[PDB]
Design a binder for these strands. Sequence first.
DNA 1: ATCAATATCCACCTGCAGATACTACCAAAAGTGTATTTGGAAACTGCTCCATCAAAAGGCATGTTCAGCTGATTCAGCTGAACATGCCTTTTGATGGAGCAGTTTCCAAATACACTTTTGGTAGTATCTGCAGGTGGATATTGAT
DNA 2: ATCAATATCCACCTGCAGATACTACCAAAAGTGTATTTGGAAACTGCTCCATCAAAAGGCATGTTCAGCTGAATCAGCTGAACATGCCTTTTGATGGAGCAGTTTCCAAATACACTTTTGGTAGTATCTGCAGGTGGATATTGAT
Lengths: 82, 87, 97, 97, 106, 106, 95, 95
Amino acid sequence: VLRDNIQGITKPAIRRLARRGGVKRISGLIYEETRGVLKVFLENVIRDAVTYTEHAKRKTVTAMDVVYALKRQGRTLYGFGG
Amino acid sequence: KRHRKVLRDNIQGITKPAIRRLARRGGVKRISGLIYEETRGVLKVFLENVIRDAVTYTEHAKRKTVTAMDVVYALKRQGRTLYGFGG
Amino acid sequence: PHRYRPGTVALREIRRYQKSTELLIRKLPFQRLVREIAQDFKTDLRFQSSAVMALQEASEAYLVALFEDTNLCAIHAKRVTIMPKDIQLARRIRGER
Amino acid sequence: PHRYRPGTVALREIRRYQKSTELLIRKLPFQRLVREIAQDFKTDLRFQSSAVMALQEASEAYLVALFEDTNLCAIHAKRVTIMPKDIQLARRIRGER
Amino acid sequence: AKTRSSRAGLQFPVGRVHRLLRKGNYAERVGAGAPVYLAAVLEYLTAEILELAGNAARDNKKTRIIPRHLQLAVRNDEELNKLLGRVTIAQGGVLPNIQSVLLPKK
Amino acid sequence: AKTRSSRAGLQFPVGRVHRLLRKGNYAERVGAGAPVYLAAVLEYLTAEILELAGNAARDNKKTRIIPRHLQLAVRNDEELNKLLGRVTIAQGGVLPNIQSVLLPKK
Amino acid sequence: KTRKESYAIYVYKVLKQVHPDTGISSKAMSIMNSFVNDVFERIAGEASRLAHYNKRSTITSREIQTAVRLLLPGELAKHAVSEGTKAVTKYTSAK
Amino acid sequence: KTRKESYAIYVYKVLKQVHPDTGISSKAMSIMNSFVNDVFERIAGEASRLAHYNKRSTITSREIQTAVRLLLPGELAKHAVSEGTKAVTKYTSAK
DNA sequence: ATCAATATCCACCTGCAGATACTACCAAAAGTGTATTTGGAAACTGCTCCATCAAAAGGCATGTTCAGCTGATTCAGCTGAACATGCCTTTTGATGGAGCAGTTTCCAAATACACTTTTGGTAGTATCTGCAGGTGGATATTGAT
DNA sequence: ATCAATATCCACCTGCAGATACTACCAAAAGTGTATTTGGAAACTGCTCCATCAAAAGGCATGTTCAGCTGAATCAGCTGAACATGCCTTTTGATGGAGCAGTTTCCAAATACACTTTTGGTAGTATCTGCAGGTGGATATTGAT
Ligand SMILES: [Mg+2]
């Protein structure tokens, strides 16, 4: 049952997130759109994290690699160090 | 110095035509009558925030004159960096 | 023979999910998506457990909040149904576009 | 007796103002407004003239961008007329509230 | 020997704060009061949040503060919310809030 | 008797860039390559903008680059537009752009 | 093996003064720790900038003060400034 | 009559290189001057943090390099990295 | 209205994941006493440019008019919500091994210091030139018809 | 479509602002060279904690049904654009001093270095408990009628 990983982010999971955000009714096209948006988000953050990893001459992305990437992307996260 | 003129209601020097021009540069075709007061408000908040920080820099430096640089630094802090005035 | 009206369960879920804090995407699917994306940047990468967690926390926060602005955009256009345009308008005004 | 249809001068103006770069708020009025607000934070202050210019350049740049965003909000609503609600939607989404 | 914190009446480490400032390349030099001042401010802000998060714990019939309690504390206070307005608290969820036009009709 | 700039094949000033790195307290120490590499990046970016600004000047039949040309350069280039997405060029104006639905007829 | 520092115990001391019967989860304490580090960096960062703008080699409480004013919202700034000037007075007079 | 430094003559050299018959207004030069100072500060900052994160006391051309990859978008980063690498290589061999 | 299906509420119970407690420990900060280096307020004064006055250039305020936009009403049809569960993917837990992190080493490269030269700034007085803002004159756009 | 009122686009010109120029000079640069300090790569290695996978858990892909939302069509009322008109306010150019900013002296304060005292992170072993997750039954809510 060959399938892209992006599709692992399923309708019901996206629906749950919408719900937490106070969304009552959802157009069918939202699911593909959201996947698109999430992919760009992860790309931007991951790119920056990995860049930290490579710099530290490591092969493991550390939570601190992510935390720092989030900080410079203007999305400071609390609870994973730093 | 003898006497020092009272400043009041100056927000109103931001005239209806001047606000229409800015809308135009911003690509706006039609403007409801209520936009002008709303814009005056928004501008006032914008200026307060920038002037507070600018003036804070002034005072920290023990000066009485607000510099182009005080404003430039204030603008930077608030994520509205300006080029053309020394920064 | 008992059916709930459209939107009753929708409201019910809003209340439920606004009350909890668990992550709402399944850990595994998300972990694969992360690794796949990272592969285009460097191969043979390993990820701390907490690093994947941090990414999830941040992604879901991001997406939950974007659904707020999106919802406001739908409401602005006198609707109750979020549409791709609403996401688009939100991201444009946020300066993501 | 001759007349342009409403909207024709408006578009004329958009082309005109989008083509130029001069400040669109009158200098002195803007200057009083600065001095007023500042005085309310602190008395007996002076301003380098370029500091006023800096503020004016920033303020007009801020306001012109806000109107594009505002304009988008109207259009999203299937209108061509900007209203306070549009400015408000823009500023919420922008995270100015 | 008596800690600079106890001299300044503070639970927060004036010593450590001093050190961290030097090895931070913030400036060539560091005056003696700066870490005291800085440490007070951090203590202060810690207290405020802990107070409100405690209250938030109480409301929900709890004695152990969790992330959810820090989130409710921060986003229900105008000033804390603004200071932390580009910050995400892991495992905090959101404030219950539903747009009224989405409520069913009476 | 040779400057480091000529040694590195650069117009931009390596000495100056070295000096400014030290006084900016970015770290205890500054390696020898850093000002070289940075001065090169600086020079690259300024060349890139000047190229594009020059073209805007010429497209307007002008010989002297003014702020409007810098703005046309930056805003017309996807990458320079993002690098400077939170920056304002005094006297730059905006890009001509009227949204479709605003135009006459159908 | 290497000692990993934290503000965790000072946060904990302050918790007790404020709510002596109330505890704190690991995850919560981590968040509190982030918070302190964050605000630390924001304040120091601004103070650094201030010193530089004014061609000064030293970060003094005056810089931390102005830093606090610039960074903190209205009421929070005021109280923090007072706690700050307080702590320095108390520290000076103490022998 | 204190000496106010800028990047103006270097911007002018580079200007001559790319557009030999084109001049630049002093306001346009001011913005050019601001832009270099800006990018300088932004790269130096990222470099600064990066060093710290890696418990390094030295900012090398390696730090600048990552800062550039962090700060700039795709194609500008690729090309800026060439030109800086090129300059360092040519700097090393030139003594 | 009533009636019933189901969601929601509160109380009480219980095992253990996750909290607080603890002592050794030792190592590494933080504080204490001595000698050194350095920064920046105060005192003074040149001198830039800021505040504050009168004359000329044109943009603002206001009323009138009606074009066309907005927002109400209605309505057909399309589209997303709700629904039941076996089925397939995720979760939980069990176990080697990559690699990260701790440690020690030693040297290439960085800091420091001291003449030595070069250069980037300004200042004075001059000298050149792109173009903004005026004119008139030929072609597009717009709206009535 | 045709006519015509009005904006728009050229082209050509000309004063002059503001730009390029240059000659004198200099202080603060950058450069050069020699002495001394050390950061971090480099290399070995110990133990997390990470990928992998088998077994146990349980959330979701499915298609069917229709309530109720979205969006097109229509229209009246009225807001906001255009424009004419009278003139107030800003803009432009030319004359007094508050305060900035540049020099210097001088001590109050921060650095440094070495020393001696404690605190705070870990690990060890055990010590303790707040509450998530389950039960039961009473009551609220929603939807059918
Ligand atoms: Mg006032």
